[PDB]
Structure formats: C-alpha cells, structure tokens
A paper describes a structure:
X-ray crystal structure analysis shows that Pf4r forms symmetric homo-dimers homologous to the E.coli bacteriophage P2 RepC protein. Li et al. demonstrated that repressor C, which they named Pf4r, was responsible for immunity to Pf4 infection and also regulated replication of the Pf4 phage by repressing the expression of xisF4. Central to these effects of the Pf4 phage in P. aeruginosa is the repressor protein, Pf4r, which not only controls immunity to infection and phage replication but also acts to regulate the expression of host genes.
P. aeruginosa PAO1 carries two filamentous phage integrated into its genome, Pf4 and Pf6, found in tRNA genes at positions PA0729.1 and PA4673.1. We recombinantly over-expressed and purified Pf4r, Pf4r* (containing the mutations Ser4Pro and Arg80Leu) and a related repressor from the Pf6 phage (Pf6r), all with a C-terminal hexa-histidine tag for purification. Crystals of the related wild-type Pf6r (1.73 Å) (51% identity to Pf4r) had three complexes in the asymmetric unit cell; however, structural alignments of these complexes showed almost no differences between each other (pairwise structural alignments of the three complexes calculated by Super Pymol range between an RMSD of 0.235 and 0.266) and the DNA-binding helices have the same spacing as that of Pf4r* Type A and the P2-repressor C protein. Aligning the Pf4r* structure with the closely related wild-type Pf6r structure (bottom left), we can see that the proline mutation has not caused a large structural perturbation, i.e., the two structures (one wild type that dimerises and one being the mutant that does not dimerise in solution) (using SUPERPOSE v1.0) are remarkably similar (RMSD 0.518 for backbone atoms) while being only 49% identical at the sequence level. Therefore, to determine if Pf4r forms dimers and the effect of this mutation on protein dimerisation, we performed gel-filtration size exclusion chromatography (SEC) and multi-angle light scattering (MALS). This revealed that both Pf4r and Pf6r form dimers in biological buffers. As with Pf4, Pf6 also causes superinfection in P. aeruginosa but only from day 6 of biofilm growth. As for Pf4, we hypothesise that similar mechanisms of gene regulation are involved for Pf6.
Author numbering:
A (entry chain A), B (entry chain B): 2 to 85
The structure:
Amino acid sequence: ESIQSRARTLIDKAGIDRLVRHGEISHSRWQSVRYKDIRMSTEELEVLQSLFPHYRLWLISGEVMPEAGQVSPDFEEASRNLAG
Amino acid sequence: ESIQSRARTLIDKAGIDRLVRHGEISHSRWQSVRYKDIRMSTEELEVLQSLFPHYRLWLISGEVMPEAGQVSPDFEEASRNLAG
C-alpha cells in the first residue's frame, strides 16, 4: 500500500535482530519506525534493500517483474500456495 | 552515493514546483529535505518514484536493469552520448 508499509513487512520478515546485525541502525530506531506512528527514512530503506535485493522494485513501487528476478513476499507466497 | 542523494538528484530534475503539483508534500518540506542536513522520508520517495517510474530500481539501489526498462538519468545521458 505504501513504501512504509512494505518496509514494515520486511522488518518483520527479517526480524530486527538481523537488521541490527546487517546495518548501523539501532534496535530502538528500528522498533520506533516499525511500531510507532513516525516517518521511515531512506536510511532504513538502505538496510532493507541491501538485505532483500530481489524485493527492490516492489519495495519502492509495489510492482514486481519476475522475469527480471524482482518479486515480493506476497508473490513468493502465492507461488508456493499454487504449487501446493 | 545513497538513496537520499539519488532522491535529491531527482528533486532537481523535476523541480520542486512540479513535485508540489504531483503530491501532498509542501514546497517548504521539499526545500527542507533538499537543502537541510535532515533525513528524507519514504513519503518524499513516494512522489519521486511515481513521477519517475523508469528510475525506480536505481532510486532504491543505485542499480539499473535497462533490458527491464529500469535506467537512470546518467545512463540515459550516456546512451544519448554513445548514440552520437
């Protein structure tokens, strides 16, 4: 729905511990942007896009392009469900 | 090179007047994120990515995928120059 909401989905998917281990941003800052009604900055996106390169197009725009390796959590879940 | 710096490049490309007409963000807020040493939020990125869809992957990551339609201002300039 928004870049912010997609970013929050990825915070949950990674878990904040993994983000703290893979960037310079603190647990308290991650917790604040995840759960408090505050803006999320490009600094948080830096960590998320580096950790999830196959989610880059979706994170910034909500679009996917599977042929180019650009997918999303929901696309991957739908694929697994249809496979089952 | 950061998301913030690429975003500022696109602020200059569009011009703040045009950005104000294409989103809910104020002229003053655009001037602040462009010219003050403050963080830029995903709310500004919303306007930039919607206005520059061909620059989405580059905005979030610095990477291009020209075969997938994902380029950058500098890549287009290099293409213009090489074409000559």
